[PDB]
Amino acid sequence: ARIAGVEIPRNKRVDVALTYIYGIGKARAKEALEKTGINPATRVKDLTEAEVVRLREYVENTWKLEGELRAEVAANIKRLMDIGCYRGLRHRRGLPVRGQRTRTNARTRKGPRKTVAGKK
Amino acid sequence: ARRRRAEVRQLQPDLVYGDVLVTAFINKIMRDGKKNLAARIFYDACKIIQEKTGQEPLKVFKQAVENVKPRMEVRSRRVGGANYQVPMEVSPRRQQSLALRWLVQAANQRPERRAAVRIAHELMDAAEGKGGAVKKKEDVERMAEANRAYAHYRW
Amino acid sequence: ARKALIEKAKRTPKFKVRAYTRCVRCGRARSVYRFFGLCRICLRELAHKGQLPGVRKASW
Amino acid sequence: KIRIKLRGFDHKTLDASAQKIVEAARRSGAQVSGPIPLPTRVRRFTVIRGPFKHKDSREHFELRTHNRLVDIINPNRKTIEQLMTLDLPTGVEIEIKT
Amino acid sequence: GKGDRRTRRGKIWRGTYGKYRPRK
Amino acid sequence: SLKKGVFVDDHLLEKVLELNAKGEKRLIKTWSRRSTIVPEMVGHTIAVYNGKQHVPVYITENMVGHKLGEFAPTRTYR
Amino acid sequence: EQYYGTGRRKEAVARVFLRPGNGKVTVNGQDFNEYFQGLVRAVAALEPLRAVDALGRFDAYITVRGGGKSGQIDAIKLGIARALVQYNPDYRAKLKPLGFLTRDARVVERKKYGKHKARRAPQYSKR
RNA sequence: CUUUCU
RNA sequence: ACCCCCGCCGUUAGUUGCCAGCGGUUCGGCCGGGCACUCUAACGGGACUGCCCGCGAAAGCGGGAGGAAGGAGGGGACGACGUCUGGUCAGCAUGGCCCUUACGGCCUGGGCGACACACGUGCUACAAUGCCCACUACAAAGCGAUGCCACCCGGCAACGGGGAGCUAAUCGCAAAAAGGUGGGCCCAGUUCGGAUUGGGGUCUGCAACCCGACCCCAUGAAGCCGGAAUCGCUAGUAAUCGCGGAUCAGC
Numbered sequence: 001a002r003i004a005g006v007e008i009p010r011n012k013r014v015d016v017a018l019t020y021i022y023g024i025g026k027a028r029a030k031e032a033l034e035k036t037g038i039n040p041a042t043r044v045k046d047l048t049e050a051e052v053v054r055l056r057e058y059v060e061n062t063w064k065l066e067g068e069l070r071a072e073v074a075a076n077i078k079r080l081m082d083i084g085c086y087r088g089l090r091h092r093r094g095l096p097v098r099g100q101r102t103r104t105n106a107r108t109r110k111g112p113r114k115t116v117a118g119k120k
Numbered sequence: 121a122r123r124r125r126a127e128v129r130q131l132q133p134d135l136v137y138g139d140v141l142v143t144a145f146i147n148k149i150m151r152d153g154k155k156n157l158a159a160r161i162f163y164d165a166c167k168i169i170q171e172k173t174g175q176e177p178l179k180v181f182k183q184a185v186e187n188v189k190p191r192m193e194v195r196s197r198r199v200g201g202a203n204y205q206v207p208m209e210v211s212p213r214r215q216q217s218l219a220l221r222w223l224v225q226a227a228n229q230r231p232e233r234r235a236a237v238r239i240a241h242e243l244m245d246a247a248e249g250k251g252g253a254v255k256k257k258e259d260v261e262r263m264a265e266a267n268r269a270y271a272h273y274r275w
Numbered sequence: 276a277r278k279a280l281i282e283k284a285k286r287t288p289k290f291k292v293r294a295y296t297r298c299v300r301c302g303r304a305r306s307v308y309r310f311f312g313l314c315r316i317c318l319r320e321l322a323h324k325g326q327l328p329g330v331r332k333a334s335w
Numbered sequence: 336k337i338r339i340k341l342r343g344f345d346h347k348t349l350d351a352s353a354q355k356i357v358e359a360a361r362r363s364g365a366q367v368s369g370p371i372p373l374p375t376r377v378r379r380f381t382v383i384r385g386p387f388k389h390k391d392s393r394e395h396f397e398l399r400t401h402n403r404l405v406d407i408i409n410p411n412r413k414t415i416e417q418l419m420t421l422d423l424p425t426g427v428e429i430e431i432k433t
Numbered sequence: 434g435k436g437d438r439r440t441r442r443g444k445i446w447r448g449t450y451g452k453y454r455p456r457k
Numbered sequence: 458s459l460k461k462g463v464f465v466d467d468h469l470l471e472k473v474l475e476l477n478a479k480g481e482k483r484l485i486k487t488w489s490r491r492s493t494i495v496p497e498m499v500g501h502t503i504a505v506y507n508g509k510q511h512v513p514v515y516i517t518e519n520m521v522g523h524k525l526g527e528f529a530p531t532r533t534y535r
Numbered sequence: 536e537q538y539y540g541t542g543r544r545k546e547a548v549a550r551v552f553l554r555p556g557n558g559k560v561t562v563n564g565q566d567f568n569e570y571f572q573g574l575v576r577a578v579a580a581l582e583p584l585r586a587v588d589a590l591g592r593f594d595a596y597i598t599v600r601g602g603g604k605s606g607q608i609d610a611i612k613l614g615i616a617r618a619l620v621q622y623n624p625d626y627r628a629k630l631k632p633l634g635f636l637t638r639d640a641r642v643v644e645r646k647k648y649g650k651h652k653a654r655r656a657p658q659y660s661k662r
Numbered sequence: 663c664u665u666u667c668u
Numbered sequence: 669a670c671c672c673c674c675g676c677c678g679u680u681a682g683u684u685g686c687c688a689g690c691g692g693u694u695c696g697g698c699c700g701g702g703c704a705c706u707c708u709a710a711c712g713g714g715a716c717u718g719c720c721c722g723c724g725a726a727a728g729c730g731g732g733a734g735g736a737a738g739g740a741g742g743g744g745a746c747g748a749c750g751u752c753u754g755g756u757c758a759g760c761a762u763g764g765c766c767c768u769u770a771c772g773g774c775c776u777g778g779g780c781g782a783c784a785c786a787c788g789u790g791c792u793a794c795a796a797u798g799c800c801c802a803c804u805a806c807a808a809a810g811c812g813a814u815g816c817c818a819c820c821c822g823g824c825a826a827c828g829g830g831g832a833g834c835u836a837a838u839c840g841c842a843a844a845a846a847g848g849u850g851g852g853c854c855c856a857g858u859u860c861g862g863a864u865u866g867g868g869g870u871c872u873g874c875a876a877c878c879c880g881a882c883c884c885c886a887u888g889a890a891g892c893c894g895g896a897a898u899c900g901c902u903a904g905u906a907a908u909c910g911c912g913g914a915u916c917a918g919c
């Protein structure tokens with residue numbers, strides 16, 4: 001059923017299905033599926049309301065998620081603007097942040113390509 | 121092959137039915153040197169021939185191949201100006217290679233999610249005369265012969 | 276610069292990580308085989324002459 | 336009881352040098368577990384032939400440390416005479432153990 | 434696969450060891 | 458990233474600590490961009506060398522974990 | 536009491552001892568079929584026996600170390616063949632025409648410099 | 663086939 | 669051709685090999701014992717178109733036997749006179765010209781890591797002949813005493829405590845991976861893919877902002893096999909899978 005923020009995982013295994021939350025990876029799924037003692041193999045479709053509650057309660061309260069995060073992360077980067085740190089510019093500039101090359105590549109962080117002219 | 125006519129690489133007979141032509145096929149099935157996985161597949165597929173027909177696998181495969189062999193093909197050709205598609209007879213070797221090449225490409229075009237199955241069904245369909253292999257083939261025999269005007273080169 | 280520097284690299288420095296190798300002949304920073312103190316060049320040279328003992332053309 | 340390791344770059348000055356240590360213990364004493372040839376440590380170095388860029392094209396050098404072994408079981412003093420300082424070391428290594 | 438730190442294969446390729454690839 | 462020190466240059470600290478015992482100076486310039494901004498040695502204005510000149514970086518509270526050179530950007534129009 | 540052939544094929548060596556009687560095969564303190572488990576190719580190693588009708592009128596004890604499992608198989612193939620020729624001068628006439636007696640000196644060829652891989656050269660652009 | 667120039 | 673490596677066999681040699689034989693085995697070649705075998709490394713043998721059929725004047729050509737191996741068995745090393753006014757004065761050497769409180773030196777800091785773009789070489793992919801998790805001996809060149817680190821314990825881990833063995837065929841790096849056996853996923857931009865990014869750490873190092881590698885949580889981008897063009901490879905090759913080294917604090 002519905003677990004966190006507003007998410008509704010469905011029809012697939014729970015270990016997978018938990019992942020569908022912003023805040024849950026393959027790891028945090030394992031943690032909460034034994035800390036509530038639910039078999040991971042069971043489909044969401046067919047798992048007790050008692051199980052759903054055990055789960056939902058642990059999850060929403062154990063760690064920060066969906067939307068709360070989304071705003072936190074956003075606020076970390078906002079914070080990196082501060083008086084104006086290095087990683088600030090980079091976020092300000094839409095450029096890579098983790099000491100990588102830019103003469104080539106760096107596409108993931110850049111507007112597809114913006115091809116130009118040159119030469120005689 | 122400027123000098124000589126190349127020795128036809130001579131092939132280990134089959135581990136199971138004792139036939140050369142089968143290794144040949146298992147080989148075309150085989151990726152990245154994984155003859156094991158390749159051979160499982162072909163055998164697993166032969167078992168699917170059993171369960172889905174009272175037929176002996178070997179003579180299904182034999183007769184599928186025989187149905188996929190092209191008689192004529194069109195090899196491209198320069199004529200001091202134009203390149204034409206020129207129809208001509210097909211070496212027994214090349215018959216056999218093109219057959220097994222197409223069987224496996226045809227197999228892997230199929231929808232069924234598991235390789236042994238695709239191999240099996242395609243084989244079945246082919247002995248019957250209606251695999252995707254045989255269309256990729258009557259297609260060839262068609263195109264040659266539909267270019268029969270240029271049969272007066274052959275080179 | 277390659278005199279003031281053959282000299283500098285021998286001086287023991289503040290911090291051992293400022294330290295480094297040098298072809299003790301052909302006075303040189305890069306490809307310097309530590310088993311010899313010898314730049315790949317000033318090395319192929321000796322290796323040829325017979326001045327590096329037991330060292331020989333490898334062929335296998 | 337006595338164990339002697341023999342290193343060296345030259346395979347003729349072991350199969351010579353230490354096969355004469357087989358006569359200088361058999362003639363002047365008792366039992367020897369013959370000379371035993373060990374795994375050799377090949378060193379290979381690989382060098383760009385030219386001084387400046389020609390990065391494909393290289394020359395291949397090895398440096399091959401041959402090892403041999405001899406064992407003598409009965410320590411006479413009739414033996415430790417040649418095997419003490421009747422010297423013919425040349426370009427050879429000597430390890431002495433027990 | 435080989436490019437994923439959180440697989441076992443990612444580790445191997447990278448030469449590393451970790452949760453996703455333990456030393457026995 | 459370390460955890461046993463914050464590896465901050467004594468020549469700066471010493472000069473900052475023995476300014477905190479009465480000291481509100483702006484002409485504090487340094488070349489140790491490699492040093493962590495230390496627990497609340499804020500308020501002051503350190504000029505950091507980018508390799509060409511010192512730039513006044515005003516140090517506030519929100520930016521304490523960081524290094525000094527994160528505010529002396531070395532290259533032009535990026 | 537004893538029969539012997541040494542097999543090699545490509546870093547693998549096969550120490551092969553035949554014996555009279557039963558039919559069963561040890562390999563490195565293991566049944567043939569649990570050592571070469573799943574590996575389709577294995578039934579080939581005993582192909583020398585089927586050749587002369589030794590089918591299973593011998594046992595075999597085999598140590599086999601070195602190289603790889605396809606190699607090990609072929610090493611054995613060779614030992615098994617070299618073994619029973621040394622227990623019958625007359626077992627050439629059946630075993631040589633099928634060359635279970637040949638070594639097969641095909642071995643991994645050496646990585647060369649310049650190349651990526653022995654022969655795979657690197658890649659032209661010319662542009 | 664195709665190729666003017668350099 | 670004379671040299672090295674790889675194919676077969678023989679001689680010489682027993683802290684690596686073994687129930688091969690027999691004995692004891694806490695059942696680990698571990699224990700006395702044994703080099704038979706395997707290997708290790710030195711020295712020999714072996715192949716000559718020598719032998720048989722066919723063609724040829726001859727060289728030699730096709731085929732056959734024997735043989736581990738034929739007709740250059742397989743891989744190296746090995747580069748004629750010369751060509752390109754090729755390459756390097758920045759490895760070094762060297763003729764000449766130029767700088768000498770500077771075109772020399774030393775330092776701290778930054779830069780060689782820039783990024784609207786274009787190209788070469790590569791990696792990882794885009795999945796079910798696949799991905800994930802567990803179990804499971806395939807074996808094969810090299811490194812290791814400012815070192816390789818078994819084994820215990822703490823930590824999810826990187827790593828941190830301790831701590832045995834090994835100057836190393838003896839001990840360690842070492843898990844080979846693909847494979848095999850079971851279990852999961854069920855064709856989804858997915859349990860494919862792992863870019864980017866937030867956060868928490870570990871290690872080397874005086875120091876990791878500009879600039880390190882690694883671990884862990886989160887985040888999961890493009891990518892569904894690539895236009896015109898175009899590359900490699902003829903066999904243990906290509907394709908694929910891991911393993912080592914050099915340089916090296918670390919990378």
Ligand SMILES: NC[C@@H]1O[C@H](O[C@H]2[C@@H](O)[C@H](O[C@@H]3[C@@H](O)[C@H](N)C[C@H](N)[C@H]3O[C@H]3O[C@H](CO)[C@@H](O)[C@H](O)[C@H]3N)O[C@@H]2CO)[C@H](N)[C@@H](O)[C@@H]1O
Pocket residue numbers: 391392393649
């Ligand atoms: N000692 C010089 C070294 O030799 C190297 O090896 C080169 C050659 O010896 C080698 O051989 C050539 C190849 O170049 C060329 N493109 C095609 C030709 N078939 C090859 O010849 C081949 O056959 C001969 C004789 O049968 C062998 O002896 C030769 O070594 C082998 N590579 O290929 C390399 C170049 O393509 C390099 N030439 C060179 O970088 C280096 O200096």
Ligand SMILES: [Mg+2]
Pocket residue numbers: 292294295
């Ligand atoms: Mg250094």
Ligand SMILES: [Mg+2]
Pocket residue numbers: 390657
């Ligand atoms: Mg290259």
Ligand SMILES: [Mg+2]
Pocket residue numbers: 434437
């Ligand atoms: Mg993945």
Ligand SMILES: [Mg+2]
Pocket residue numbers: 534535783
């Ligand atoms: Mg810019």
Ligand SMILES: [Mg+2]
Pocket residue numbers: 643
């Ligand atoms: Mg290979």
Ligand SMILES: [Mg+2]
Pocket residue numbers: 667
């Ligand atoms: Mg004109």
Ligand SMILES: [Mg+2]
Pocket residue numbers: none
């Ligand atoms: Mg010029």
Ligand SMILES: [Mg+2]
Pocket residue numbers: none
């Ligand atoms: Mg400087």
Ligand SMILES: [Mg+2]
Pocket residue numbers: none
């Ligand atoms: Mg550069």
Ligand SMILES: [Mg+2]
Pocket residue numbers: 892
């Ligand atoms: Mg898809």
